[PDB]
């Protein structure tokens, strides 16, 4: 009620207050801890292994030196308070670029208790490195961390735990990415042991699979329609040579048409994907066709046989073919 | 364990402090050790002829100034004392856009020690400038350095060395590139000499190695079978003028098109790249075959002698030429 | 989950190859480093290797003499002994790291294990 009470003993709280030195500094290791509220994870980028993440990161410590009495209430006060108060030198060891809306002001929260609990909140949006492996791609599963480690002060001086255990973190439901889907994620606690010392190491990890059914429709079908083309030739008489030389050179240039525009939206791995064999082996297939009409055509000036064996062969040994790439990367 | 005990060493240290002067003043330079934690390397842009480095830079000298006796510890200060500390001018002579992580504070690290050695560690994301020889592309091989240098004090005030010698940088083989491999690293100390006097100088360089997989499946492959898919003319008969004539544009068309494709994704350097050489040589082969399709219809209307010829020459020459291609960029 | 077996280890007074397979979530865990642990004595780091890239970092005592190599495709790492000393008695361990569990030489970083081949000479 009493706000100059009120101004005097926050006053109190700052006067003499040393932001340089940790609570309880040469005694126990002061425990944060941490609850985070995601909000949105915007993109995922394939091109830049990384993901970027927006929450509402929450810290939760005990300081003695905050510690008030005679004000049975919890001082919600201005974030600009914060600047005058200790907290924790927490820093995401995998994140790219980071920063923290300040529009209308700095998404910052202090929220003092009696006991000297302090809560921090801050609304961050961080890019944070995320190693994918595209062998499987794009039938792949991904797993995405998110490092939450000190910097400065070891285990000794500092300890990390997730607050509330498994409900640490919240919000993983109401992710909506557009060609992901969050199958799990977990949540660890570990300590990191480095030249300067051990670090306590908290650890977001999601579990991310690609939906195939954009890739199912523009990439795999157009391809699959393609290959059956080619093999119209086969029906297609043999005296007929402008008509099987045009369906076999341009069933290769519709071949190199898909494959020039699939292959840009990737970066340069030179693993082969099961999108990289799928096209390929198509536009081999394709090349084995126009190959088949050229020893027709040749021995022609049997010929009816060998039409009859690739007409038999060839279906057979694409469908061989997809049966096993599909098996090998499902 | 006194707080106040600390907190008055610390101000003692800070009081009558000045900035402005380097330790040991108008006598001995100082030495200052530096080693590096690499993070990771985020990209290498050939268009551009930079990298992105993200790296703990950290900084070993001994400042009497600050040397503090009774408190047998290593004082891990708030990163914001390093405002009220003298830090050396180092930069980097070849970057381009470098900045420090300020997520949740500024990722930076001071640590005294009772004889006045300070430790200064910064995590810092940089994009450092590299020339690269694009001669052998995309088979060659290059030397990305990181210039380190003093920007005001010249050999005279300050002196640069490695800390731990070889052991200086580490985490190199975390660097996982998706389109290099880390061959060596190594680094150098020399004195750089100006019109302003001599500076001390570290270098950081990297050896990266194309990866060529991506490129033989994507580029070769194709550019190999439409050429070979070219030679299926000579085996047509010669009456069939639509179905050559048909299969030779096409090809030309198909050469145009994956032409159009694959040099966008690079810088217009004027000298013939490995790839250069590899398309257009491609490219004349099918414009060879074409016209040899002429002066058999021109002749005719020996004609079966040049179609004769035409196919033991071409396939000889085009692995002529391939031969003396590998063998020349390998 | 990764499931390390080694082998190759036997007993002689001389070159040797250890491999070690894995199995499992290979890629979460891209460094593999070689550990050993004398009777009476804690685990000492000998080298780390990484899955991806093939950059090597050796102990300062087995430096030039032990050499080791990996292929993702066989998805095993070869551990290369040469010039044996008796100092060589331990149990050879192998082991994975996370991509960011922090330093190589600390066993306590890495998180899979094998089971370990003891070696005397």
């Known amino acids: 009620g009493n706000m100059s009470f009120v101004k005097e003993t926050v006053d109190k709280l700052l006067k003499g207050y040393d932001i340089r030195l940790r609570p309880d500094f040469g005694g126990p290791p002061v425990c944060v801890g941490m609850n985070i509220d995601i909000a949105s994870i915007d993109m995922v980028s394939e091109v830049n292994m990384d993901y970027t993440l927006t929450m509402y990161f929450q810290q939760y410590w005990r300081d003695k030196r905050l510690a008030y009495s005679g004000i049975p209430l919890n001082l919600t006060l201005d974030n600009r308070v914060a600047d005058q108060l200790w907290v924790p030198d927490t820093y995401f060891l995998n994140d790219k670029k980071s920063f923290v809306h300040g529009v209308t002001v700095k998404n910052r929260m202090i929220r003092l208790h009696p006991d000297g609990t302090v809560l921090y909140g801050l609304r961050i949006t961080t890019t944070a490195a995320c190693m994918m492996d595209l062998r499987r791609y794009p039938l792949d599963e991904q797993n995405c961390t998110l490092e939450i480690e000190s910097y400065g002060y070891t285990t000794d001086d500092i300890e990390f735990y997730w607050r509330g255990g498994d409900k640490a973190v919240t919000g993983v439901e109401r992710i909506e990415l557009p060609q992901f889907s969050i199958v799990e994620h977990r949540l660890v606690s570990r300590n990191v042991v480095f030249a300067t010392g051990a670090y306590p190491r908290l650890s977001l990890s999601f579990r991310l699979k690609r939906n195939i059914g954009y890739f199912i429709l523009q990439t795999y079908m157009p391809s699959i329609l393609i290959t059956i083309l080619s093999w119209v030739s086969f029906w297609i008489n043999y005296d007929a040579s402008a008509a099987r030389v045009a369906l076999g050179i341009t069933t290769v240039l519709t071949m190199t048409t898909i494959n020039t525009h699939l292959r840009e939206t990737l970066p340069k791995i030179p693993y082969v994907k099961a999108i990289d064999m799928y096209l390929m082996g198509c536009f081999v297939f394709v090349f084995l066709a126009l190959l088949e009409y050229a020893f027709v055509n040749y021995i022609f000036f049997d010929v009816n046989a060998i039409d009859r064996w690739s007409r038999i062969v060839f279906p057979f040994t694409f469908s061989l073919f997809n049966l096993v790439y599909w098996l090998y990367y499902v | 364990g006194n707080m106040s005990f600390v907190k008055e060493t610390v101000d003692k240290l800070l009081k009558g402090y000045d900035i402005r002067l380097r330790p040991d003043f108008g006598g001995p330079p100082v030495c200052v050790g530096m080693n590096i934690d690499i993070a990771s390397i985020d990209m290498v842009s050939e268009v551009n002829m930079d990298y992105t480095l993200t790296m703990y830079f950290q900084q070993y000298w001994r400042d009497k100034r600050l040397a503090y006796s009774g408190i047998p510890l290593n004082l891990t200060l708030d990163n914001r004392v390093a405002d009220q500390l003298w830090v050396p001018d180092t930069y980097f002579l070849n970057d381009k856009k470098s900045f420090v992580h300020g997520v949740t504070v500024k990722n930076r690290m001071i640590r005294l020690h009772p004889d006045g050695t300070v430790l200064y560690g910064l995590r810092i994301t940089t994009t450092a400038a590299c020339m690269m020889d694009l001669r052998r592309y995309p088979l060659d091989e290059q030397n990305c350095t990181l210039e380190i240098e003093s920007y005001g004090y010249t050999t005279d005030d300050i002196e640069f060395y490695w800390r731990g010698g070889d052991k200086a940088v580490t985490g190199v083989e975390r660097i996982e590139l998706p389109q290099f491999s880390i061959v060596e690293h190594r680094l150098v100390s020399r004195n750089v000499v100006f019109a302003t006097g001599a500076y001390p100088r570290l270098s950081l360089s990297f050896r990266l190695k194309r990866n060529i997989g991506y490129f033989i499946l994507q580029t070769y492959m194709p550019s190999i079978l439409i050429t070979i898919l070219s030679w299926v003319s000579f085996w047509i008969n010669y009456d069939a003028s639509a179905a050559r004539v048909a299969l030779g544009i096409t090809t030309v068309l198909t050469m145009t098109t994956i032409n159009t494709h694959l040099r966008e994704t690079l810088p217009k350097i004027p000298y013939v790249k490995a790839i250069d050489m590899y398309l257009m040589g491609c490219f004349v082969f099918v414009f060879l075959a074409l016209l040899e399709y002429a002066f058999v219809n021109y002749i005719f209307f020996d004609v079966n002698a040049i179609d004769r010829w035409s196919r033991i020459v071409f396939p000889f020459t085009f692995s002529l030429f391939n031969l003396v291609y590998w063998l020349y960029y390998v | 989950q990764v499931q390390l077996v080694e082998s190759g280890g036997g007993l002689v007074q001389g070159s040797l190859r250890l491999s070690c397979a894995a199995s499992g979530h290979t890629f979460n865990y891209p460094i593999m480093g070689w550990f050993r642990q004398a009777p009476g004595k804690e685990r000492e780091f000998v080298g780390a290797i990484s899955w991806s890239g093939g950059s090597t970092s050796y102990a300062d005592s087995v430096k030039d003499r032990f050499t080791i190599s990996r292929d993702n495709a066989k998805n095993t790492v070869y551990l290369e002994m040469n010039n044996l000393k008796p100092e060589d008695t331990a149990v050879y361990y192998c082991?994975?790291?996370?991509?960011?569990?922090?330093?190589?030489?600390?066993?306590?970083?890495?998180?899979?294990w094998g089971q370990g081949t003891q070696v005397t000479v």
């Open positions: 082991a994975a790291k996370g991509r960011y569990s922090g330093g190589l030489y600390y066993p306590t970083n890495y998180d899979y």
